Amino acid sequence: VGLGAFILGFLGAAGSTMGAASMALTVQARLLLSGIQHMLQLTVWGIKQLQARVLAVERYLRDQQLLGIWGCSGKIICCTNVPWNDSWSNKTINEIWDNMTWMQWEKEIDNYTQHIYTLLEVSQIQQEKNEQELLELD
Amino acid sequence: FILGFLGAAGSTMGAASMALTVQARLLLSGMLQLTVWGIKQLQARVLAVERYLRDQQLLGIWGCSGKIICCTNVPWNDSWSNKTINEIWDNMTWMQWEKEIDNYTQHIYTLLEVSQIQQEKNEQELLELD
Amino acid sequence: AVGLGAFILGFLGAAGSTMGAASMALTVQARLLLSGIQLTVWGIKQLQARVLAVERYLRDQQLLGIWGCSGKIICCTNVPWNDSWSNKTINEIWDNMTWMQWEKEIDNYTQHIYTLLEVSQIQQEKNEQELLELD
Amino acid sequence: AKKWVTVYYGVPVWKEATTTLFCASDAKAYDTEVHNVWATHACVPTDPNPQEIVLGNVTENFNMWKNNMVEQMHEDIISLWDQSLKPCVKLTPLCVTLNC
Amino acid sequence: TTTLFCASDAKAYDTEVHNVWATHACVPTDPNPQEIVLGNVTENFNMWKNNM
Amino acid sequence: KKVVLGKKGDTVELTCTASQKKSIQFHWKNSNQIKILGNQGSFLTKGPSKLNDRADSRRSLWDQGNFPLIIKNLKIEDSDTYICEVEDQKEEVQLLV
Amino acid sequence: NCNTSVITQACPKVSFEPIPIHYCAPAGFAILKCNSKTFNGSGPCTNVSTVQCTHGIRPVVSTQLLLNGSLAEEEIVIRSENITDNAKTIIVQLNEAVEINCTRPNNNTRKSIHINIRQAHCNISKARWNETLGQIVAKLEEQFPNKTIIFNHSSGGDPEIVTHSFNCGGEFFYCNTTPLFNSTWNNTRTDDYQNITLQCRIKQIINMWQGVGKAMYAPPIRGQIRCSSNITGLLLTRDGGRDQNGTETFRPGGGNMRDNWRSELYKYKVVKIEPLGIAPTACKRRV
Ligand SMILES: *[C@@H]1O[C@H](CO)[C@@H](O[C@@H]2O[C@H](CO)[C@@H](O[C@@H]3O[C@H](CO[C@H]4O[C@H](CO)[C@@H](O)[C@H](O)[C@@H]4O)[C@@H](O)[C@H](O[C@H]4O[C@H](CO)[C@@H](O)[C@H](O)[C@@H]4O[C@H]4O[C@H](CO)[C@@H](O)[C@H](O)[C@@H]4O[C@H]4O[C@H](CO)[C@@H](O)[C@H](O)[C@@H]4O)[C@@H]3O)[C@H](O)[C@H]2NC(C)=O)[C@H](O)[C@H]1NC(C)=O
Ligand SMILES: *[C@@H]1O[C@H](CO)[C@@H](O[C@@H]2O[C@H](CO)[C@@H](O[C@@H]3O[C@H](CO)[C@@H](O)[C@H](O[C@H]4O[C@H](CO)[C@@H](O)[C@H](O)[C@@H]4O)[C@@H]3O)[C@H](O)[C@H]2NC(C)=O)[C@H](O)[C@H]1NC(C)=O
Ligand SMILES: CCCCCCCCCCCCO[C@@H]1O[C@H](CO)[C@@H](O[C@H]2O[C@H](CO)[C@@H](O)[C@H](O)[C@H]2O)[C@H](O)[C@H]1O
Ligand SMILES: CCCCCCCCCCCCO[C@@H]1O[C@H](CO)[C@@H](O[C@H]2O[C@H](CO)[C@@H](O)[C@H](O)[C@H]2O)[C@H](O)[C@H]1O
Ligand SMILES: *[C@@H]1O[C@H](CO)[C@@H](O[C@@H]2O[C@H](CO)[C@@H](O)[C@H](O)[C@H]2NC(C)=O)[C@H](O)[C@H]1NC(C)=O
Ligand SMILES: *[C@@H]1O[C@H](CO)[C@@H](O[C@@H]2O[C@H](CO)[C@@H](O)[C@H](O)[C@H]2NC(C)=O)[C@H](O)[C@H]1NC(C)=O
Ligand SMILES: *[C@@H]1O[C@H](CO)[C@@H](O[C@@H]2O[C@H](CO)[C@@H](O)[C@H](O)[C@H]2NC(C)=O)[C@H](O)[C@H]1NC(C)=O
Ligand SMILES: *[C@@H]1O[C@H](CO)[C@@H](O[C@@H]2O[C@H](CO)[C@@H](O)[C@H](O)[C@H]2NC(C)=O)[C@H](O)[C@H]1NC(C)=O
Ligand SMILES: *[C@@H]1O[C@H](CO)[C@@H](O[C@@H]2O[C@H](CO)[C@@H](O)[C@H](O)[C@H]2NC(C)=O)[C@H](O)[C@H]1NC(C)=O
Ligand SMILES: *[C@@H]1O[C@H](CO)[C@@H](O[C@@H]2O[C@H](CO)[C@@H](O)[C@H](O)[C@H]2NC(C)=O)[C@H](O)[C@H]1NC(C)=O
Ligand SMILES: *[C@@H]1O[C@H](CO)[C@@H](O)[C@H](O)[C@H]1NC(C)=O
Ligand SMILES: *[C@@H]1O[C@H](CO)[C@@H](O)[C@H](O)[C@H]1NC(C)=O
Ligand SMILES: *[C@@H]1O[C@H](CO)[C@@H](O)[C@H](O)[C@H]1NC(C)=O
Ligand SMILES: *[C@@H]1O[C@H](CO)[C@@H](O)[C@H](O)[C@H]1NC(C)=O
Ligand SMILES: *[C@@H]1O[C@H](CO)[C@@H](O)[C@H](O)[C@H]1NC(C)=O
Ligand SMILES: *[C@@H]1O[C@H](CO)[C@@H](O)[C@H](O)[C@H]1NC(C)=O
Ligand SMILES: *[C@@H]1O[C@H](CO)[C@@H](O)[C@H](O)[C@H]1NC(C)=O
Ligand SMILES: *[C@@H]1O[C@H](CO)[C@@H](O)[C@H](O)[C@H]1NC(C)=O
Ligand SMILES: *[C@@H]1O[C@H](CO)[C@@H](O)[C@H](O)[C@H]1NC(C)=O
Ligand SMILES: *[C@@H]1O[C@H](CO)[C@@H](O)[C@H](O)[C@H]1NC(C)=O
Ligand SMILES: *[C@@H]1O[C@H](CO)[C@@H](O)[C@H](O)[C@H]1NC(C)=O
Ligand SMILES: *[C@@H]1O[C@H](CO)[C@@H](O)[C@H](O)[C@H]1NC(C)=O
Numbered sequence A: 001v002g003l004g005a006f007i008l009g010f011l012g013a014a015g016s017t018m019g020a021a022s023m024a025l026t027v028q029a030r031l032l033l034s035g036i037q038h039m040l041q042l043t044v045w046g047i048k049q050l051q052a053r054v055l056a057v058e059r060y061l062r063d064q065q066l067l068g069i070w071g072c073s074g075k076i077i078c079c080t081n082v083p084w085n086d087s088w089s090n091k092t093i094n095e096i097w098d099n100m101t102w103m104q105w106e107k108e109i110d111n112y113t114q115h116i117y118t119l120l121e122v123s124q125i126q127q128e129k130n131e132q133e134l135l136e137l138d
Numbered sequence B: 001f002i003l004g005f006l007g008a009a010g011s012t013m014g015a016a017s018m019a020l021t022v023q024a025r026l027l028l029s030g031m032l033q034l035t036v037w038g039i040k041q042l043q044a045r046v047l048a049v050e051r052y053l054r055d056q057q058l059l060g061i062w063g064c065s066g067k068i069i070c071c072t073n074v075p076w077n078d079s080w081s082n083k084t085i086n087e088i089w090d091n092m093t094w095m096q097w098e099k100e101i102d103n104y105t106q107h108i109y110t111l112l113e114v115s116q117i118q119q120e121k122n123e124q125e126l127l128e129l130d
Numbered sequence C: 001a002v003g004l005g006a007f008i009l010g011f012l013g014a015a016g017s018t019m020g021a022a023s024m025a026l027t028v029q030a031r032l033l034l035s036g037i038q039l040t041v042w043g044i045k046q047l048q049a050r051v052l053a054v055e056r057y058l059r060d061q062q063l064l065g066i067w068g069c070s071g072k073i074i075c076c077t078n079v080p081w082n083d084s085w086s087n088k089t090i091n092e093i094w095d096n097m098t099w100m101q102w103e104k105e106i107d108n109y110t111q112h113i114y115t116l117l118e119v120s121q122i123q124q125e126k127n128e129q130e131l132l133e134l135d
Numbered sequence D: 001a002k003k004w005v006t007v008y009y010g011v012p013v014w015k016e017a018t019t020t021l022f023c024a025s026d027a028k029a030y031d032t033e034v035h036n037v038w039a040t041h042a043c044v045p046t047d048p049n050p051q052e053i054v055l056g057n058v059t060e061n062f063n064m065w066k067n068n069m070v071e072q073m074h075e076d077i078i079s080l081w082d083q084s085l086k087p088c089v090k091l092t093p094l095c096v097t098l099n100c
Numbered sequence E: 001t002t003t004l005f006c007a008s009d010a011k012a013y014d015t016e017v018h019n020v021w022a023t024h025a026c027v028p029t030d031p032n033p034q035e036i037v038l039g040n041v042t043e044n045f046n047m048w049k050n051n052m
Numbered sequence F: 001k002k003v004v005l006g007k008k009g010d011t012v013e014l015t016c017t018a019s020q021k022k023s024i025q026f027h028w029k030n031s032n033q034i035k036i037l038g039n040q041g042s043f044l045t046k047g048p049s050k051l052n053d054r055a056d057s058r059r060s061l062w063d064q065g066n067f068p069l070i071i072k073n074l075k076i077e078d079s080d081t082y083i084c085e086v087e088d089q090k091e092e093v094q095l096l097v
Numbered sequence G: 001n002c003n004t005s006v007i008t009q010a011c012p013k014v015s016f017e018p019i020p021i022h023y024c025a026p027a028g029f030a031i032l033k034c035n036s037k038t039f040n041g042s043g044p045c046t047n048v049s050t051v052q053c054t055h056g057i058r059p060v061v062s063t064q065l066l067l068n069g070s071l072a073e074e075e076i077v078i079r080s081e082n083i084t085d086n087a088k089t090i091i092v093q094l095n096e097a098v099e100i101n102c103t104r105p106n107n108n109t110r111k112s113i114h115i116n117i118r119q120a121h122c123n124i125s126k127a128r129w130n131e132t133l134g135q136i137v138a139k140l141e142e143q144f145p146n147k148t149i150i151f152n153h154s155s156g157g158d159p160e161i162v163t164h165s166f167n168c169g170g171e172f173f174y175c176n177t178t179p180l181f182n183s184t185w186n187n188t189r190t191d192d193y194q195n196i197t198l199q200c201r202i203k204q205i206i207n208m209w210q211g212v213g214k215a216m217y218a219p220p221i222r223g224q225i226r227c228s229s230n231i232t233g234l235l236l237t238r239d240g241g242r243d244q245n246g247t248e249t250f251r252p253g254g255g256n257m258r259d260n261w262r263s264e265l266y267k268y269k270v271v272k273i274e275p276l277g278i279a280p281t282a283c284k285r286r287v
């Protein structure tokens, strides 16, 4: 968790715009990779803190595999082949990436997410069929 | 924990796959004695995670690293099993199927390793040209 | 994970073994493993060590994506070796040197190498996306 | 350029929750006073080293009259209350399930 | 360059100051410590540069 | 509007209803927005109304979702339209004494 | 047909003194807190922080005044769901506490008058009370700038809300607050001039606050009853109407325990994380 106040949501700080968070993340990633009075109740709190950490890990791993349904297994950032509709959003790339935070962005398209998720599933199914059909020849 | 797919082979293999697809869609679409038991429960959860991560990387030896379902290029031998795809997937549960072929697995595991080695060898030789 | 390391991290092999020997031992264990062939105070301390190691592991597995090695333990790249960093041959180092000896030998080139790896990955992604401009 | 869908995991976004909170208090656990007695079995000790993170330039909409923490606190207190200050005589209405 | 935990078989109730300090300064010792002998590794130690 | 009738000196019951079948905070008001009755927690509160002495409610039915206004000893001048506020719906009844 | 269900229970007395209780989110959840010193009852906060646990709140049960709790950081803040709604509770949080000292004298031993052990009283410092109201009025005038502010006693209802009510050590007290709310205001005070003494009675048959019903408690403790509380707020109800020609009246409200807890929990919100998001980019997946 290079960025963020939460274990999950590790791609950035709340309040940062989406583009800014990405740039900050790249820098932090580079640095990390490059290597650049006991109280009795402490027992209780130690367990609770570990449970929070363990739970985040369990969820993380679960989601990393579930995303395979859209062809995004094991990824944090996953590019797809589904076109963006101006109907979902009439904003352009720079204005959303530079001026909107992730919460604002999700609010902007909140009631289209179920539609988009459906489309992603469909695309992955067709991609899989195409590969296997080619392998019936090869 | 993974505990397989949590169905205890109480359903056939085909049914389990369909159920997983459904759940993946739903999931993505959206007191002194407590110290002792809290620790034991927590230890078990940690252990499950460590084994999972290890095995996902160990499977790289067969070219299946990081996958839950891994399609290989090793052909099926009717001698291992003479059943068809539908017979196996629709009528058998996982604990019935593994029993049917329980002692052919060591042979299969060997074949999987061999196939992966040959595939890697071929790719690297091609890359000495390209 | 694999009882060659003697540490939670550093699992590819025991300290003191040559790099080559460690790889061979690791292959053997993979086959064996896949083939199937005050207590409260210390319990918490042990778990903290294990949880932390897992978190670092996962973190790094994703951070390595920056060089195109996400999700890998062993990863091959397209950055050529500079004889200037090291004048030794492949069997020379893999057969006779341990990991610590090797890392000490090329320690001051590490940041140079890391920089090159990032640059290569950027160029690779750029090239692929340009091809996909038409394809 | 052509705009394409990209999926991101690890996005710093949150929604309102409806969950169960834990209570904590510095119960004496030897005293006979009601709140200490209840807390002894109902609650955990407080956090010896609490932390607070100030968020960046964010705006969050709060609403004290739609706050479900209130209802939960209400239930905990009633349970506490009725395990202690027991009346000599308790009288409550009860009606027949008729449509009248 | 890190911070280590102290551990001791403190009694506390004895009132002796090391036991009283230890009561909160430290934790109980490991009831079942383990040691791993490493392979043929040579390591340079220096007691005069030891930050512990 | 619902219309309820009675004679001077009589007693009538005007009602509000919740679909909740639970005790809900509710209020009764006259046409001049003067509070008459309401539910505060489990208690009956009365407003600064001419009906403060006449107004009552069957507290035992509050958990049935029934929130009546009972007006005893009706005066001819009590013939107003009373307003219910339950949950977030409003109801109106005209009383003719 | 409704039939009262009656349960007879043992009647022990117990020591009874509220302890601060903190609430903590479970794993997977976090609590956001509003850090504005001027925060409203609802709406945006720009200073927001994340905590795992709330501050402690003592589980104090009272009906007209909030007797033990936190204070506002700078100013008296008046919070209401709808200030123009005659039916809503107005919660006034003070930035300073007013001490109230209640007692049951050991010499009050009379048991009956004719065919006092239930007699008690509470003191408020006059200068604290008048200062408190003057500040409240100044804030009420921000909402009602052209109207006279009248404080008054309750308009009627069950005694638990008509009088002030609290519990010390199992003793249920009912106190007359007419002396606190008989004041009328302009930008100036209309009262006289040290100690405002409230008359209190200790009762055995009380209404339930936790539900609808009645409850009877054992008779009073022989002596030495004392309470020492910090008033940190008021529960007021505004009396409006079509004929309120230049005057607004504020009477003690309350009786709804949810309002008492809201007066402390207004700064906290519980949230969950949804880490999966979507946005357009200019990349394409190779297929
Ligand atoms: C807002 O928060 C504040 C917090 O500060 C709340 O204020 C607190 O309210 C408490 C309510 O009871 C009150 O508690 C009382 O304190 C008395 C004084 O305690 C101190 O002195 C004693 C002296 O020995 C010390 O031991 C103690 O540690 C303190 O230093 C206590 O004496 C009271 O206990 C007695 O009454 C309770 C009532 O339920 C009984 O349960 C308890 O068993 C005690 O009963 C004795 O008295 C009765 C009288 O008839 C006897 O019948 C009985 O047998 C006991 O008598 C024996 O002891 C007396 C002692 O003199 C002796 O004379 C007799 O002969 C017997 O031996 C009780 O603990 C807090 O003090 C008070 N805090 C402050 C600062 O004032 C405030 O209420 C909150 N607001 C709201 C709305 O909740
Ligand atoms: C606190 O609130 C109370 C309640 O509102 C308020 O006291 C009320 O003042 C009004 C002032 O008009 C009183 O109303 C009248 O008082 C006279 C006194 O003798 C009565 O005679 C009147 O009754 C006649 O007129 C009525 C008009 O409809 C007839 O219905 C009736 O049959 C009579 O003909 C009338 O009551 C009102 O009674 C008081 N209420 C109480 C409980 O005293 C009080 O002043 C407020 N406090 C402050 C500080 O302002
Ligand atoms: C916090 C605990 C840490 C996580 C616990 C699990 C960590 C993993 C421990 C064992 C990992 C070993 O996983 C290792 O994978 C690499 C490839 O990906 C394989 O290494 C492979 O290199 C190439 C092919 O990749 C070939 O030479 C040969 O097939 C094999 O040696 C090893 O066969 C396998 O042993
Ligand atoms: C929940 C358990 C606790 C830990 C969870 C797992 C740790 C993950 C947290 C950090 C994740 C960031 O890991 C991220 O990986 C992706 C690829 O996969 C990389 O993706 C990278 O793509 C290219 C570089 O090629 C850049 O345009 C981009 O800025 C960069 O993000 C990021 O450089 C790296 O920062
Ligand atoms: C948000 O509110 C917090 C809480 O008051 C402010 O930070 C505090 O500043 C005081 C000043 O002495 C410190 O003592 C506290 O420890 C600080 N608290 C925390 C949690 O840091 C904070 O500055 C406010 N932020 C904004 C943007 O107004
Ligand atoms: C206190 O609550 C009121 C009621 O919601 C807030 O008033 C609203 O403020 C927003 C801010 O942009 C306006 O758009 C709304 O139109 C306002 N509503 C009304 C009815 O005017 C008020 O701002 C809140 N005060 C604070 C400090 O947040
Ligand atoms: C509450 O305040 C009253 C104010 O009168 C106190 O009663 C006075 O106490 C003094 C103490 O010397 C006596 O001289 C006065 O004569 C008393 N006045 C009356 C009218 O009796 C009362 O004791 C205080 N009570 C509490 C709980 O503090
Ligand atoms: C309620 O009792 C408290 C405690 O005795 C009074 O406050 C004390 O007043 C004396 C007077 O000199 C001060 O020395 C103490 O320091 C005060 N105590 C505290 C905690 O401040 C309080 O004034 C009484 N309140 C009323 C209304 O009589
Ligand atoms: C509070 O006390 C006042 C008196 O101090 C009570 O009001 C008095 O009630 C009698 C009853 O006939 C009237 O004659 C007096 O004129 C009233 N006095 C005042 C100042 O109004 C009052 O009812 C008590 N209130 C409660 C809730 O007990
Ligand atoms: C009422 O408020 C007073 C302060 O106005 C509280 O007394 C202070 O509590 C703090 C807590 O750390 C102490 O450090 C101060 O020394 C106390 N002041 C005095 C004069 O004693 C008091 O405890 C509050 N009472 C209640 C019931 O909450
Ligand atoms: C908040 O605005 C200031 C203005 O300069 C900026 O520096 C800071 O980084 C912003 N915080 C976030 C989270 O963007
Ligand atoms: C997205 O564009 C396609 C192009 O024809 C259109 O059919 C579809 O309805 C669009 N989606 C929305 C939500 O408008
Ligand atoms: C939507 O896109 C069209 C494209 O020309 C633009 O004209 C229109 O103003 C956009 N609407 C909004 C609300 O941005
Ligand atoms: C971001 O908002 C500022 C506000 O003035 C605007 O000027 C800027 O052009 C916006 N960025 C983009 C990419 O539209
Ligand atoms: C999303 O909700 C808003 C709320 O009014 C609505 O106007 C908008 O059309 C909704 N969008 C979709 C895709 O349903
Ligand atoms: C697979 O089938 C072929 C068919 O001739 C047979 O020769 C071979 O031995 C079989 N392999 C195994 C492992 O049984
Ligand atoms: C085994 O496979 C052969 C292949 O032709 C088939 O004829 C035979 O019936 C199969 N036996 C069983 C039991 O399925
Ligand atoms: C499953 O068993 C039943 C039993 O008669 C059989 O009819 C059915 O065809 C079997 N299904 C498959 C896929 O073999
Ligand atoms: C598996 O075990 C059974 C037990 O009798 C045996 O008959 C069968 O031939 C074994 N199969 C293999 C592949 O060894
Ligand atoms: C240590 O030396 C012995 C001598 O035979 C050798 O067998 C062993 O493998 C060595 N261990 C390492 C780690 O080199
Ligand atoms: C790596 O080899 C290239 C080949 O021209 C050389 O220019 C470069 O300086 C070498 N790197 C170092 C560190 O010498
Ligand atoms: C590097 O290897 C070559 C091979 O002949 C050797 O001549 C050269 O001296 C070596 N470099 C150094 C610094 O010894």
Ligand SMILES: *[C@@H]1O[C@H](CO)[C@@H](O)[C@H](O)[C@H]1NC(C)=O
Binding pocket: C091, C092, C093, C095, C096
């Ligand atoms: C390893 O060291 C021995 C020592 O005699 C040497 O003979 C051998 O050639 C070395 N191996 C390599 C690969 O240099």
Ligand SMILES: *[C@@H]1O[C@H](CO)[C@@H](O)[C@H](O)[C@H]1NC(C)=O
Binding pocket: C107, C108, C109
């Ligand atoms: C690497 O460190 C060694 C230690 O003395 C030094 O001799 C060598 O020249 C260093 N190499 C570089 C490139 O700085």
Ligand SMILES: *[C@@H]1O[C@H](CO)[C@@H](O)[C@H](O)[C@H]1NC(C)=O
Binding pocket: G148, G186, G187
């Ligand atoms: C309040 O004070 C002003 C000061 O001139 C006065 O005019 C006004 O009449 C006063 N209010 C009432 C109700 O008398």
Ligand SMILES: *[C@@H]1O[C@H](CO)[C@@H](O)[C@H](O)[C@H]1NC(C)=O
Binding pocket: G127, G130, G131, G134, G187, G188, G189
């Ligand atoms: C409140 O009481 C103080 C006591 O001296 C007095 O000076 C002040 O003027 C009073 N408040 C008002 C508004 O008169």
